[PDB]
Design a protein around this ligand. Structure first.
Ligand SMILES: COc1ccc(C2=NN(C3CCN(C(=O)CN4C(=O)CC(C)(C)CC4=O)CC3)C(=O)[C@@H]3CC=CC[C@H]23)cc1OC
Ligand SMILES: [Mg+2]
Ligand SMILES: [Zn+2]
Length: 330
């Protein structure tokens, strides 16, 4: 039969929501046999006609995607393939915002989406500080500097060398060099130690914002173009509290499981327990409200100004969720 199975039909119907904020990504993960990253990336590549544009052989794309997904750890609660798929899809929605229509080139679009897909690959489920404090091999390889983020990049690129995995094999050297630099700049910007400087620069850009005729953002140098892409993927990475609450709470459960596990390791070892990682002295709800107030809302408020009024519903959902978590603090 050259026709989908019923489970593949149910999956294809869920994937009709790929252009929407609030895609049922956990359901996609179940329906695809734990291939949310592969199926969501493929759908996006097809939808944006990236295979044709970059002459990517379909089998090579699928092989690379499965390989990349395979390098996300299934035994990690939050920083796994479902998170990668979610960041990919959220970036895909943000790239389609009316205020950015026709701003970015196909190569820049490719860069933002590919960066999103690789941005947490091979994450061990512990923080940079934990890796540094434990004298881990990763921290030694990267000289304690954006350890995880450098690692995600190195793995994401190295996997292109596996059998029939080089999705960029038909790009010119000039295209490849440009793509690579942008990908590196985007993934390194996902290190939360960079958040305050990224946000400061995004605020400066909003303050000196120029729009073209027809009211789309004018970005006429690399610094500004990459700043916007960096902040975009960073928004996607920090998008959990902006999603419908049924999704958000699953993300909260997962990050807390991950953090608590790290805290258990820190406690076993006699180390100081990192913020939000002590399961005996946690308030999950207060932690979410703090995460929103201090990190997520300042970023998304500034993004919303940049693309005004495109992100109003996202900001409203964020504010509703914040009130919900506040109302459950004992
Ligand atoms: C679903 O909820 C979460 C999803 C992801 C994260 C991540 N945590 N972090 C860091 C973010 C900054 N941080 C803070 O604790 C900052 N912060 C608060 O959020 C609340 C507070 C402790 C009361 C005061 C305050 O300053 C440390 C942890 C990461 O680095 C992860 C990797 C990349 C992006 C974000 C992700 C946290 C979530 O809820 C807490
Ligand atoms: Mg990360
Ligand atoms: Zn991430």
């Amino acid at each position: 039969f050259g026709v989908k199975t019923e489970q593949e039909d149910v999956l294809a119907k869920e994937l009709e929501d790929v252009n929407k904020w609030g895609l049922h990504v956990f359901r996609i993960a179940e329906l695809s046999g734990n291939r949310p990253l592969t199926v969501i990336m493929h759908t996006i590549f097809q939808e944006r006609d990236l295979l044709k544009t970059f002459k990517i052989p379909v089998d090579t794309l699928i092989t690379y995607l499965m390989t990349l997904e395979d390098h996300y750890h299934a035994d990690v609660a939050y920083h796994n393939n479902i998170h990668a798929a979610d960041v990919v899809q959220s970036t895909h929605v943000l790239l389609s915002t009316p205020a950015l229509e026709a701003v970015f080139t196909d190569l820049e679009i490719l860069a933002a989406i590919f960066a999103s897909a690789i941005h947490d690959v091979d994450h061990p489920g512990v923080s940079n500080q934990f890796l540094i404090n434990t004298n881990s091999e990763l921290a030694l390889m990267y000289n304690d500097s954006s350890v995880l983020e450098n690692h995600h990049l190195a793995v994401g690129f190295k996997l292109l060398q596996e059998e029939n995995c080089d999705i960029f094999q038909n790009l010119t050297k000039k295209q490849r060099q440009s793509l690579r630099k942008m990908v590196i700049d985007i993934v390194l910007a996902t290190d939360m130690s960079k958040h305050m400087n990224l946000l400061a620069d995004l605020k400066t850009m909003v303050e000196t914002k120029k729009v073209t005729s027809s009211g789309v953002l004018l970005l006429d140098n690399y610094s500004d173009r990459i700043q916007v892409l960096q902040n975009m993927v960073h928004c996607a990475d920090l998008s959990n509290p902006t999603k419908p609450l049924q999704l958000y709470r699953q993300w909260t459960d997962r990050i807390m499981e991950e953090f608590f596990r790290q805290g258990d390791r820190e406690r076993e070892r006699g180390m100081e327990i990192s913020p939000m990682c002590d399961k005996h002295n946690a308030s999950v709800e207060k932690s979410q409200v703090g995460f929103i107030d201090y990190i997520v809302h300042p970023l998304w408020e500034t993004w919303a100004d940049l693309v005004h009024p495109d992100a109003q519903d996202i900001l409203d959902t964020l504010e509703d969720n914040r009130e919900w978590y506040q109302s459950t603090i004992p």
